[PDB]
Design a binder for this molecule. Structure first.
Ligand SMILES: Nc1ncnc2c1ncn2[C@@H]1O[C@H](COP(=O)(O)OP(=O)(O)OP(=O)(O)O)[C@@H](O)[C@H]1O
Ligand SMILES: [Mg+2]
Lengths: 12, 294
């Protein structure tokens, strides 16, 4: 799959 | 449950993609077919309670969708365990894998040429049509990307993976601020900044999908970390044009990446723009040309 297409970030 | 399927009717054949998605056989699930080849999504044994809840919400969300350009739910096995989510098998998998397979030097190159302009336009129109339907149903997708678009036996592209999809009937937006494992390279600046998701922020992601198509699914903002993309895009940064990218697609992409969400096109506008440059079957199957688009 593509787990690297997500990262731990903060929004808002 | 009108969606309930007898478990004895499902046979798993191989793993399609890691909750494991399987290719399966389903007996007597589609009228006029004694047995249908299907995809079957399941939950990991070690999935957290949040993940288990989201998987069930995803299946539930899919029950309300009927669109040629959206992956069809076929049934649910919910009696006993485990829960099987049965859907339309997409013979060519996800668009990201498919596009990467079309690179000149890809080991798995299927021996077919990379997409023509017409084929890219057809893909665009199909993705946009599925998204126009989703929006009209008052959902925001939140994870539109090539990896979540699926490719049929006839190369029709359809929207899939509704894991991040949220109902926006009451307000036209979903807001979720805070920390998360998020698709940062696909996200609009206002989503990054204000934590807000709308059809306009889905439109930003549509621009990135166009960029994926014309780059054969390169990684967006390569050389940049997740945290740098976050800064870059919030500050008005966007992607450069792929090598030899057709001008007409570039123009569209740039319209999708307007900093102000109010200035981006709508999905109906995208389909309308492309409608004369499509395969003759499109008005027979599209949400755009359907009585439902009122
Ligand atoms: N209906 C389908 N037909 C064929 N292949 C599929 C289908 N659904 C998924 N796949 C393949 O498996 C991969 C994972 O599927 P999907 O994106 O739906 O799961 P996921 O990423 O785990 O979802 P979520 O983001 O909700 O956790 C896809 O990128 C695709 O290659
Ligand atoms: Mg996915």
């Amino acid at each position: 799959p593509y787990p690297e297409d997500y990262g731990d970030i903060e929004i808002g | 449950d009108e969606w309930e399927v007898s478990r004895e009717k499902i046979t798993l054949l191989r793993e399609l993609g890691q909750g494991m998605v399987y290719e399966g056989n389903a007996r007597d699930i589609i009228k006029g077919e004694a047995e249908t080849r299907v995809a079957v999504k399941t939950v990991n044994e070690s999935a957290s309670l949040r993940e288990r809840i989201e998987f069930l919400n995803e299946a539930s969300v899919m029950k309300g969708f009927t669109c040629h350009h959206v992956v069809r739910l076929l049934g649910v096995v919910s009696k006993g365990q485990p829960t099987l989510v049965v859907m339309e098998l997409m013979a060519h998998g996800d668009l990201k894998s498919y596009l990467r397979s079309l690179r000149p030097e890809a080991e798995n190159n299927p021996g077919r040429p990379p997409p023509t302009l017409q084929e890219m336009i057809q893909m665009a129109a199909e993705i946009a049509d599925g998204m126009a339907y989703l929006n009209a149903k008052k959902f925001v997708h939140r994870d539109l990307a090539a990896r979540n678009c699926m490719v049929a036996h006839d190369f029709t592209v359809k929207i899939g993976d509704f894991g991040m999809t949220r109902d926006i009937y009451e307000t036209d937006y979903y807001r979720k601020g805070g920390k998360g494992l998020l698709p940062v390279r696909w996200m609009a600046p206002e989503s990054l900044k204000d934590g807000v998701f709308t059809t306009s922020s889905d439109m930003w992601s549509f621009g990135v999908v166009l960029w994926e198509i014309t780059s054969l699914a390169e990684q967006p903002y390569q050389g940049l970390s997740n945290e740098q993309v976050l800064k870059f895009v919030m500050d008005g940064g966007y992607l450069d044009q792929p090598d030899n990218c057709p001008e007409r697609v570039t123009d569209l992409m740039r319209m999708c990446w307007q900093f102000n969400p109010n200035m981006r096109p709508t999905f109906l506008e995208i389909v309308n723009l492309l409608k004369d440059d499509l395969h003759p079957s499109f008005p027979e199957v599209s949400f755009f040309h359907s009585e439902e688009n009122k």
